[PDB]
């Protein structure tokens, strides 16, 4: 009733992806960096998996931008790093994974601005 086979999962031959889009691509698993123009941090909660950038050229007519690769606009969202890594291995894509960066705790004191002797004294407010 149960095979109880011991082997890694591989569904490469069932997805129908062309061979040149499997052994040549290089996916990236990362937590997207916070947009420095904004102080919101709601876009740095989940893990993102995205493919590498390929060639884009100018259209001879009308000057539009043309891309010859299908996977360019693809992006996937994963709850944790392990799930994304498992997905990448299961689909047979070579991956580069980067550890999530979290800002370190910083101690902020209102009292420091009006310091008697330390250099943290503010010139104006």
């Amino acid at each position: 009733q149960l095979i109880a086979v011991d082997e890694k999962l591989d569904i490469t031959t069932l997805t129908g992806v062309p061979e040149e889009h499997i052994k040549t691509r290089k996916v990236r698993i990362f937590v997207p960096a916070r947009n420095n123009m904004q102080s919101g941090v709601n876009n740095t909660k989940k893990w993102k998996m995205e493919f590498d950038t390929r060639e884009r050229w100018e259209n001879p007519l009308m000057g539009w931008s043309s891309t010859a690769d299908p996977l360019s606009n693809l992006v996937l969202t994963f709850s944790t790093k392990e799930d994304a890594v498992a997905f990448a291995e299961k689909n047979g894509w070579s991956f580069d994974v980067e550890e999530r960066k979290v800002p370190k705790p910083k101690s902020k004191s209102y009292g420091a601005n009006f310091s008697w002797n330390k250099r943290t004294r503010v010139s104006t407010k």
């Binding site: 709601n42 590498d52 884009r56 370190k104 910083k106 902020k108």
Partner: protein, 690 residues
């Protein structure tokens, strides 16, 4: 421990005493709305948007500035806090101009998003709004002060982070304005960062004005290469064209800011570009050909000569992949004349010991020092983020700074020990009182720049600095793994080249003039055609037409740092890889690919075919290059120091003058900067002001 228990919406959490309500809310997992609070800046309390209700307290407290005490239950989603937020947004938007369609911060405005999430949906303001005249603070920051919300964030950044007191608030009441009160240009190496911190479209990027919208752009996380700091950046592109560069958070290298040269010199990527191979014709002029022709000529010339007759020079913007590929190619022809533009004293340990040419204490470890000694360096213009870190430690850790060199302005007060290099020996001798004042220092630190090494006294100056560090270690004892000795670099490609066995300096070329010279992006002007034999063969392989292009015989177009996945090692020894944002224009190709194709044409086929194989070769040559966030390394100060005591070169009576004397010299440093219109505008504005 000393942690105290505080409740957020009834959920308990441990917080260290002195933690504000806002930080506790972040610890639980919620972000309090904010306009004036920045973690890297001093607390202000102006915008009053962070007003939150404490249970059983009739008054609403400001979460950013109120320290929390044991037992408090913070009701963030209570009715009172919501009403306070709505009122604050209504007051903020009462006088805001209806400039959203024309504002450069349309889809990335904190005002817009926070009004959508926490504010109301209509206005009862039936009066006329105010309007203030625009200010002019230079050609980098476009200023529209009608949109200012008077959060005094730029003022705090300029006063503390940049150390420049040009900005301030003039006036009282509703008509209080933010500006300089006079026609003055806010000029600094970190001037552009005020664009990012400003929540509204009051301060925007002038070169980027009216160009794109945030939702259109695609973000590529990459590494800056204009200096040796290696600050992380986000290249923002749109339809295969680089739109802008933004800083990326990294608490150990650049925090969240980038220098002006990093931020605004991407424009040079669109000018003077090398797009096709070029060869010399019958008349001696440069004409376009195909890859096959140029590769065939170069391979024939490489096959004809052999040994010391071939040579290569590495530029300041070359990646490790190209460096190792060229090293392999010239080794297959039995050559070792591999040189870089910047010189490093090879006497003694030289480049065999890695800790002999790195910033051992690291930028993050700067904050733990109590004294610092700068020798012949101008960190403000050579490594602006390093200088910013020094300034932050000086402001917060009460660090003591001393400089040996010209009395440059470092945006903080330091002790000017002198100008002559002889003072170094004095510090080594023990007559100078600074030796005594640094003897008691628990975590001393000595920094020596490559500018002081470019002169003929590199060996002697390095030996004197190592002697000073030895005196520190022997007298005060080994404090631990503190790694007193440091060296600060200027070009991004220096450390990667040194780790690969490249011979620093161009002296080898002068001693043995080659018959065919490889210019791997060498635009420093160190070697001209006068100090080379007649009918010499010059191959230039770069991305910009600069001082090294017209003297070449065959030109191979390379790729810029935004057009390839390449490895760069910063001044701390940390290796980081960039990502492909756009593809090289025209017929330009990747550098290591060009080297491999040339090798295969010449018959000396290289083992690697793909990028992964080249990186495996890099791992074989050096283990450290493959690691992409590791900075720790072994401390071999004793061996290098003992090997450095053999030769006894003397110091000359010339004062240590860095090349970066004034801000006008900081803008144009490499090929990309010299091709940027924005940098030319900055230089013109600095030279003469209006």
């Amino acid at each position: 421990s000393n942690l105290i228990e505080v409740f957020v919406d009834g959920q308990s959490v441990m917080v260290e005493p002195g933690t504000t309500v806002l930080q506790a809310c972040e610890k639980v997992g919620m972000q309090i709305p904010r306009f004036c609070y920045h973690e890297r800046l001093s607390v202000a309390g102006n915008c009053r948007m962070c007003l939150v209700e404490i249970e059983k307290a009739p008054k609403v407290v400001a979460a950013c500035a109120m320290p929390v005490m044991k037992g408090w239950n913070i009701l963030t989603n209570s009715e009172k806090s919501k009403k306070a937020r709505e009122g604050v947004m209504e007051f903020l938007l009462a006088n805001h101009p209806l400039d959203c369609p024309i504002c450069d911060q349309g889809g990335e405005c904190d005002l817009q998003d926070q009004s959508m999430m926490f504010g109301s949906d209509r206005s009862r303001f039936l009066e006329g709004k105010r309007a203030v005249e625009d200010k002019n603070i230079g050609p980098l920051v476009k200023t529209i002060m009608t949109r200012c919300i008077q959060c005094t964030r730029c003022i705090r950044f300029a006063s503390e982070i940049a150390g420049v007191d040009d900005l301030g608030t003039t006036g009282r009441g509703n008509d209080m304005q933010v500006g300089t009160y006079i026609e003055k240009m806010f000029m600094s190496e970190l001037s552009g960062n005020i664009i990012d911190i400003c929540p509204v479209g009051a301060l925007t990027s002038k070169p980027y004005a009216f160009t794109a919208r945030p939702w259109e752009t695609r973000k590529t996380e990459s590494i800056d290469v204009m200096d040796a700091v290696g600050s992380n950046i986000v290249v923002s592109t749109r339809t295969g064209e680089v739109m802008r560069i933004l800083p990326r958070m990294h608490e150990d290298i650049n925090e969240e800011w980038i220098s002006d040269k990093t931020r605004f010199a991407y424009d040079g990527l669109k000018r003077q570009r090398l797009t096709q191979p070029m060869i010399r014709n019958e008349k001696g002029l440069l004409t376009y050909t195909t890859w096959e022709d140029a590769l065939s000529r170069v391979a024939g010339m490489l096959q004809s000569f052999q040994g010391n007759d071939v040579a290569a020079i590495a530029g300041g913007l070359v990646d490790a992949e190209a460096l190792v590929a060229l090293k392999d190619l010239l080794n297959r022809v039995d050559s070792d004349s591999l040189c870089t533009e910047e010189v490093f004293p090879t006497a003694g340990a030289g480049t065999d010991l890695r800790s002999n040419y790195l910033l051992n204490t690291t930028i993050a470890g700067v904050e733990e020092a109590d004294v610092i000694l700068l020798v012949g360096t101008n960190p403000r213009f050579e490594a602006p983020l390093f200088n910013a870190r020094i300034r932050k430690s000086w402001l917060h850790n009460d660090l003591k700074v001393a400089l040996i060199g010209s009395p440059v302005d470092l945006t903080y007060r330091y002790d000017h020990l002198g100008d002559s290099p002889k003072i170094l020996q004095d510090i080594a001798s023990g007559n100078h009182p600074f030796s005594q004042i640094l003897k008691e220092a628990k975590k001393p630190m000595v920094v020596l720049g490559s500018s002081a090494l470019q002169r003929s006294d590199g060996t002697a100056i390095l030996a004197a600095v190592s002697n000073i560090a030895q005196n520190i270690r022997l007298s005060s004892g080994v404090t631990g793994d503190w790694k007193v000795m440091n060296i600060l670099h200027r070009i991004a490609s220096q450390v990667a080249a040194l780790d690969l066995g490249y011979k620093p300096g161009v002296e080898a070329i002068r001693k043995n003039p080659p018959k065919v010279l490889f210019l791997l992006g060498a635009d420093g002007g160190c070697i001209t055609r006068q100090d080379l034999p007649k009918d010499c063969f010059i191959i230039y392989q770069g991305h910009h037409g600069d001082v090294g292009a017209p003297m070449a015989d065959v030109i191979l177009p390379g790729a810029a740092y935004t057009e390839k996945s390449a490895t760069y090692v910063n001044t701390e020894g940390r290796a980081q890889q960039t990502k492909v944002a756009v593809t090289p224009p025209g017929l330009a190709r990747e550098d290591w690919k060009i080297i491999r194709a040339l090798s295969e044409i010449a018959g000396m086929t290289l083992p690697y075919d793909t990028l992964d194989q080249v990186r495996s070769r890099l791992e074989e040559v050096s283990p450290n290059l493959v690691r992409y966030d590791d900075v720790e390394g072994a401390n071999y100060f004793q061996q290098a120091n003992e090997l450095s005591k053999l030769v006894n070169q003397q110091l000359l009576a010339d004062p240590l003058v860095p090349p970066q004397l004034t801000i006008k010299d900081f803008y144009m440093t490499d090929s990309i900067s010299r091709a940027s219109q924005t940098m030319a505008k900055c230089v013109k504005a600095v030279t003469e002001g209006i």
